[PDB]
Structure formats: C-alpha cells, structure tokens
C-alpha cells in the first residue's frame, strides 16, 4: 500500500505530458521505457535519481513535489535514469560531525542544524572527513544548499571519494526534509 510506497513518473516531454514511467521501486535502468526525462512529479516521498543508469553520474534526490519540467530540478540536463526509495531520517534527530583533515583529523564541528555556507562559518575549504551520520545526508558541492549532492550508504567517511566525490572540495549542507 503506501505509509512508504515512494512513487516517481518521468514523462516524455513538459507539464507531464507525451510519453510517461511509473515506478515505486528501485530499478536498475528504465530509460528502456522512455528516451527523454522530462517533467516530473513523485505521488509518494522522496526518491534517488542518477543522472545516468546503473546508480552512476550526477545523484539527485527528487523530494515528494511537483516538477513542471526538467529545470525544477535545477536543470542538470535532461538525463534522468532509474531511482531508489529514499526514506527520512528520524533515528537519531540531526547530527554531522566535520573534520578539517580527512582520517577523521583537524577541526571537528558539531552542529543539529542545515548550514548554507560551510566555509563561512566552519572556516572549511575542504571537508576530507565526517563522522556521525543520521539515517539519509545530503551534501551540496556549492553553498546555498545547491551544487551536486553526494548521497552514498555508508557508516563513515575518512576520505575525500567515501561520499562519492572526486575530491573534499564540497560546501555546506541542509537537513533533509519533506
């Protein structure tokens, strides 16, 4: 039923129009049932999208919301591939843990909040480490919250690639919500 079932459609063209997939549950690649991601709104919660199949490329995490078309997810191009139900985290409130040196090393900060600029209030340039993990992150390449977001499973991150990024140069980030 639902009270989980996190459901996504890709539709062919805009305003949810022309060609259509629905699915609520993970897939490996649907882009067999549609040649281009256009518009989108989840009749569910929130999703796991990758700009490319296989779970590779950009990770975008659609919430539960309408998408008139492709740019309401900040127009990363029109490459939308299969997704994974992404739940909320709840198990333990909100805590992130930063370290200046990856290896767990440097300047640690500690905060239960979103934070928009890390750089301008943690001083980070360069986040190599992070501990302490709550259920679902999302961390923004760029400040403001934007810029790709890294979405990996994992316990821990001691080095700059454990988020899936090709390098510690990240930004802030913000609790997710929905």
Known sequence: GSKTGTKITFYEDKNFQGRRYDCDCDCADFHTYLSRCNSIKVEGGTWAVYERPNFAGYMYILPQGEYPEYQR??????????????????????????????????????????????????????????????????????????????????????????????????????????
């Not at 990856?102 to 928009?116: A, H, I, K, N, V």
């Not at 923004?140 to 090709?166: C, F, H, S, T, V």
Request: proline residues 5%; charged residues 25%; glycine residues 8%.
């Open 73 to 178: 997810w900040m127009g990363l191009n029109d490459r939308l591939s299969s997704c994974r139900a992404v739940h909320l985290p709840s198990g333990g409130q909100y805590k992130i843990q930063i370290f200046e040196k990856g290896d767990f090393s440097g300047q640690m900060y500690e905060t239960t909040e979103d934070c928009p600029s890390i750089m301008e209030q943690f001083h980070m340039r360069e986040i190599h480490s992070c501990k302490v993990l709550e259920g679902v992150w999302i961390f923004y390449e760029l400040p403001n919250y934007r810029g790709r977001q890294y979405l990996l499973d994992k316990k821990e991150y001691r080095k700059p690639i454990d988020w899936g990024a090709a390098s510690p140069a990240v930004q802030s980030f913000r609790r997710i919500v929905e």
